[PDB]
Amino acid sequence: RITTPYMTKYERARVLGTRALQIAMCAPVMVELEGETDPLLIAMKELKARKIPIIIRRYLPDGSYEDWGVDELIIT
Amino acid sequence: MVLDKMHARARGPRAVLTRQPTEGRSRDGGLRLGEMERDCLIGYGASMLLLERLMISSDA
Amino acid sequence: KYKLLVEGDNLRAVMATHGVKGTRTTSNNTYEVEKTLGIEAARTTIINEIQYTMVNHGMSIDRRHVMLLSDLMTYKGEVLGITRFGLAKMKESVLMLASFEKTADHLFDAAYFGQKDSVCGVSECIIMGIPMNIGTGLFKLLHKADRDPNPPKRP
Amino acid sequence: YMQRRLVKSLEDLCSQYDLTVRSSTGDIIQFIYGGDGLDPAAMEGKDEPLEFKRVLDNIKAVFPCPSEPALSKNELILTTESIMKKSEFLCCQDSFLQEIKKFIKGVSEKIKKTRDKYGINDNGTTEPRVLYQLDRITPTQVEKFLETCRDKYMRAQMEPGSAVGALCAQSIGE
Amino acid sequence: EDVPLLLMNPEAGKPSDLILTRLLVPPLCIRPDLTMKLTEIIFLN
Amino acid sequence: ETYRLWKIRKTIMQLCHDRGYLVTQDELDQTLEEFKAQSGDKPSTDLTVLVAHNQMFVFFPEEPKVGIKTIKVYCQRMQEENITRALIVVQQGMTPSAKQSLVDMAPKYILEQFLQQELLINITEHELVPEHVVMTKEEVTELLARYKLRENQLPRIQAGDPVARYFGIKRGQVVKIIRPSETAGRYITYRLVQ
DNA sequence: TTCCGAGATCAGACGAGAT
DNA sequence: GTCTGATCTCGGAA
Numbered sequence: 069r070i071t072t073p074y075m076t077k078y079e080r081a082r083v084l085g086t087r088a089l090q091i092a093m094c095a096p097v098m099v100e101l102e103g104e105t106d107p108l109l110i111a112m113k114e115l116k117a118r119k120i121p122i123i124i125r126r127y128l129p130d131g132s133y134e135d136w137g138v139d140e141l142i143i144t
Numbered sequence: 145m146v147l148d149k150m151h152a153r154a155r156g157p158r159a160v161l162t163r164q165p166t167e168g169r170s171r172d173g174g175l176r177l178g179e180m181e182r183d184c185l186i187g188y189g190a191s192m193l194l195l196e197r198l199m200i201s202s203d204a
Numbered sequence: 205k206y207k208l209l210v211e212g213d214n215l216r217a218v219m220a221t222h223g224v225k226g227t228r229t230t231s232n233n234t235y236e237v238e239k240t241l242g243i244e245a246a247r248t249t250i251i252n253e254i255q256y257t258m259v260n261h262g263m264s265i266d267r268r269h270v271m272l273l274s275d276l277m278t279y280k281g282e283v284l285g286i287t288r289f290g291l292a293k294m295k296e297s298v299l300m301l302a303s304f305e306k307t308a309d310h311l312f313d314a315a316y317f318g319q320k321d322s323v324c325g326v327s328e329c330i331i332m333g334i335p336m337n338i339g340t341g342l343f344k345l346l347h348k349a350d351r352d353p354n355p356p357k358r359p
Numbered sequence: 360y361m362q363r364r365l366v367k368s369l370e371d372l373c374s375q376y377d378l379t380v381r382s383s384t385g386d387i388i389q390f391i392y393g394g395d396g397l398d399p400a401a402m403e404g405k406d407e408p409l410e411f412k413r414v415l416d417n418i419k420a421v422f423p424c425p426s427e428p429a430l431s432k433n434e435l436i437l438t439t440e441s442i443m444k445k446s447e448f449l450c451c452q453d454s455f456l457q458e459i460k461k462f463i464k465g466v467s468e469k470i471k472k473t474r475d476k477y478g479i480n481d482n483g484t485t486e487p488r489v490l491y492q493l494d495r496i497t498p499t500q501v502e503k504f505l506e507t508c509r510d511k512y513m514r515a516q517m518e519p520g521s522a523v524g525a526l527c528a529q530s531i532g533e
Numbered sequence: 534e535d536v537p538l539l540l541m542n543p544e545a546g547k548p549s550d551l552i553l554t555r556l557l558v559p560p561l562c563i564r565p566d567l568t569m570k571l572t573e574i575i576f577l578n
Numbered sequence: 579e580t581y582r583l584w585k586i587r588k589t590i591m592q593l594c595h596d597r598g599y600l601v602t603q604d605e606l607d608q609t610l611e612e613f614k615a616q617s618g619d620k621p622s623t624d625l626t627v628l629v630a631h632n633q634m635f636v637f638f639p640e641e642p643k644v645g646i647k648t649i650k651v652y653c654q655r656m657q658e659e660n661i662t663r664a665l666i667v668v669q670q671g672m673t674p675s676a677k678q679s680l681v682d683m684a685p686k687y688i689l690e691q692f693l694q695q696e697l698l699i700n701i702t703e704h705e706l707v708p709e710h711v712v713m714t715k716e717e718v719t720e721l722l723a724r725y726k727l728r729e730n731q732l733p734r735i736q737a738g739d740p741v742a743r744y745f746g747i748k749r750g751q752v753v754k755i756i757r758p759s760e761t762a763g764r765y766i767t768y769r770l771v772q
Numbered sequence: 773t774t775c776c777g778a779g780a781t782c783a784g785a786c787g788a789g790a791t
Numbered sequence: 792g793t794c795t796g797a798t799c800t801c802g803g804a805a
Contacts, residue, residue: 071376076518078189078340085192086345123346126519129375129385130726137348144514149791160565169791180788183366186326187525189339189373199333219699222581226699230706237706240696242741244755245706254531267406268393269530272380272523276369276388279733281772286368288784289796294368296384304367306784316551318542325371325383338373338383342520360787379725386731394757394765407761454762645805673805674776 071126071134075141079124080115083138087111087120115143151175164202216240238283246283250274300327362532372524374517392517395454399530401515408455408515409508411462418504419495429497430483431470438498439463442505455512459505470494582698583620584613586667589697590627590636596702597746599629628661636665644668646676649689656687663746664689667697690746701740710741711754713768718752721768732770747771 075083091097091114092107098119104110114120115138124136149169156172158165165174177197185194210218215236219226231237232253238246251267251274258265276294277284284290288305295301298314298321314321323329329336371383378396380389393399403410439460448456474480478490485491517523536543558571588608595601610617616624625638635656639648644666656664664687666672672691680689701707713721722729729750735742737749747753749771757765 072516072519074513074516074518076520078518078520079343081190082192082340082343082345085340121348123348125344125346126376127343128377128726129379129381132726134376135346161563167790176789178788180362182330183370183525183528186336186338186366186370187522187529189520189522191336191339191341194330195333195335198330216693216695216699220695222579227704240740241701241704242707242739243735244708244710244741244757245704248706248708265530266399266402268397268399268402269527271393272372272389272527273369273531275733276372276524279386279388281734281736286364287796288364291368300367300371300383309784315545317540318545320542327367327370338371338525339520339522342373342376360785363787377725381731387725387727387733390725390767394759394762454764458761643805647805675774675805 069134071128071136073142075138075143079141080143083120083122083124084108084111084115087114087122162203234283238278243278243282247274247278250277250283295325297321297323297325297328299323299331300325303327303331362528365532366525366528369524369528370522372522372527373520374523376519378517378519380523392523395452396517398515398517399526403515407458408512409458411459411508414508414511415466415504418500418507422500422503423495424497424499427497427499428483429491429495430480431494431496432467432474432480434498435467435470435496435501436464438501439505442502448505448509451509451512459508463501466494466496470496579621580610580613580617582694583625584608584610584617586638586694586697587613587625587627589700590665590667591629592700592702593697593744594627594629594634594636596744597634598632599634600632601629628659633661634663634665635659635661636667638667640669642668642670643673644676645673646679649676649679653683656689662687666691667694668692669694688746690743692743696740701744707741708758709756710745711756712745712747713752713754717754721752729770732768734772735769736772742771 087095088108088111091110097110097114098121099110099113099117101110101113104113111120118139120138122138124138124141126134126136128134151169151173153165153173153175156165156174159167166172167174167176182194182198185197212218213233213236215231215233218224219229219240230252231249234246234249234253237249251270254270254273255265255267258270277286277290280293284293291301291304292310298310298319301310302314304310304327321328323332323334324337326336326338335341372380372388374380374392374396378391379387380392381387397408402408443456443459473493478485478487478493480491483491536547539548541548556574559567588606591601591606595606623638623640627636628634637652639651641648649666652664666689668691671693677691680691683689702710718729721727732752735753737743737747742753745753751771753769753771755767755769757767759765
């Protein structure tokens with residue numbers, strides 16, 4: 069609950085990083101897509117519709133963690 | 145003239161000792177992503193790129 | 205108003221003389237501020253004398269970069285200049301030192317000691333081919349699929 | 360060479376998630392990055408994230424609000440306190456939150472200096488109506504001024520895990 | 534007792550092997566001119 | 579000239595006020611005229627302070643290079659008065675055999691050593707040196723916990739640093755540094771000592 | 773009496789990449 | 792072909 073409630077540019081990159089690679093292995097798509105064949109262009113459609121089945125595990129450097137749903141974050 | 149300098153290497157010969165792509169266009173190239181450009185890829189914070197660019201598509 | 209600049213090095217012998225208000229006198233030699241005025245004044249000269257020589261050449265720069273470079277350079281006790289020698293007193297891991305200069309001695313000497321290095325930083329995770337933890341590899345990602353720690357069966 | 364020595368020491372620093380900047384070995388170099396935890400990249404001129412004169416004039420021009428009362432000096436300091444402690448502005452550390460307040464009173468006195476010359480604000484009606492557009496600051500703007508200066512300050516923080524020293528090695532070396 | 538006092542972590546290696554009575558030759562796959570220095574040893578051996 | 583035999587006494591009674599003793603305020607600030615009571619005599623030890631905590635014992639041995647015997651002059655009155663801490667403010671420096679005599683008799687009595695021209699300026703009121711503040715034992719435990727940091731892993735200041743030697747700090751203590759800035763002025767950093 | 777300062781000699785390094 | 796800290800030898804002293 070203590071880290072920044074803004075999705076950083078390093079979290080948006082990897083969430084788009086692995087949701088692209090998930091959807092390029094026939095994952096179920098959450099956005100009823102409209103002809104986009106680039107898997108990366110599907111993932112930004114997933115982000116803006118805020119439907120990504122991914123929870124960011126944010127590591128405080130002592131070892132404790134703090135989860136954050138991608139629904140529960142403020143993208144830019 | 146650009147015909148003597150146009151160059152692209154998809155996947156070709158690797159050097160016999162270190163199994164990296166060779167040096168030169170006469171030997172089908174591969175251009176060195178040098179250690180100065182390593183820091184540029186560090187400073188962007190792109191972690192999964194550097195694993196892809198220095199382990200996956202060079203020495204897998 | 206009058207001040208006087210010297211071309212010398214003996215700082216506290218200058219700071220203590222009669223007439224000079226030693227509360228307001230600086231150097232440009234960051235070691236002679238470290239020996240004489242503590243480390244924290246040696247941090248502020250490394251901030252200043254870089255930000256003095258950077259605005260002299262045009263070349264504007266944020267202070268927050270120099271506030272990091274100074275604060276790295278003086279955080280382990282004394283001012284550790286970024287040479288080959290200052291890296292040994294800053295880093296523990298071998299391959300980060302071994303990828304820098306003196307690759308022969310730094311690898312044999314860390315075999316003489318039984319040096320167990322963990323693989324961290326970026327100069328070793330790039331060598332080993334691990335995704336580095338600096339930047340996009342800091343956190344990690346979960347999946348949000350349907351799961352629960354379920355009840356078992358009666359046995 | 361000086362690029363090489365710089366980046367071969369400074370590469371393994373990143374601003375962790377609790378805003379501290381640590382080495383690879385866990386040891387703390389800085390407690391907040393650069394005192395305020397702010398990106399130099401997103402940083403505005405003068406090493407300040409806002410440059411408040413530009414944002415307030417931007418807000419007055421993007422949102423001119425006609426048919427609005429625009430009363431001031433007795434309401435401006437009163438609206439800027441009612442908005443600033445209102446369920447928000449907790450993550451704004453109060454060194455920036457002072458800096459809005461010293462700017463708002465700095466533009467609060469600029470209003471009364473013009474209304475000192477002429478044009479009493481007795482209820483917002485004098486006979487030449489144009490005079491209330493001298494320093495118009497109407498409270499639809501000053502609340503959008505704060506919700507922008509908050510969010511421009513919150514956005515221009517150092518994003519956690521950003522290869523902080525690797526930015527430093529380029530910005531000294533280049 | 535006195536091996537850790539020379540700071541040699543004896544799980545890594547005791548001081549008797551700072552000098553060479555046998556010697557690993559590197560594998561052939563990492564040398565397809567250092568072979569020439571190996572045969573110069575066995576000549577002298 | 580006497581700008582010293584006075585300002586040194588001015589400095590150490592700023593120094594042991596910062597270290598938390600009970601120097602009355604009128605004894606702290608003297609103009610030179612308040613020290614012109616003794617001013618002609620001491621050039622051509624009459625200067626030794628004992629102050630206690632809310633007890634140090636400074637020394638100005640008139641010998642330039644203090645030898646082991648000169649320490650041994652007041653090794654005995656150190657253990658006579660049951661005093662635990664001392665100061666030896668020297669003129670030139672210690673003889674290179676005498677500095678061990680401090681660390682041979684280390685845990686019984688402390689007796690830190692200063693030079694003269696080291697002490698002629700108060701380095702705390704220097705513009706470059708920010709306000710070091712020694713933190714208490716409970717001030718460390720609320721530090722480590724907030725940052726979730728082990729005692730080690732804090733930024734480190736040497737024990738022989740000029741401001742650690744000023745404030746009189748043994749190993750294991752943590753100073754709090756208020757570095758002044760321009761936007762905030764309250765950029766706080768901490769330092770574990772070595 | 774020993775120990776620490778100051779005299780000699782010794783190190784590893786001295787940008788990317790390209791044909 | 793220097794620029795470099797380290798590490799070895801001399802020497803004058805409390």
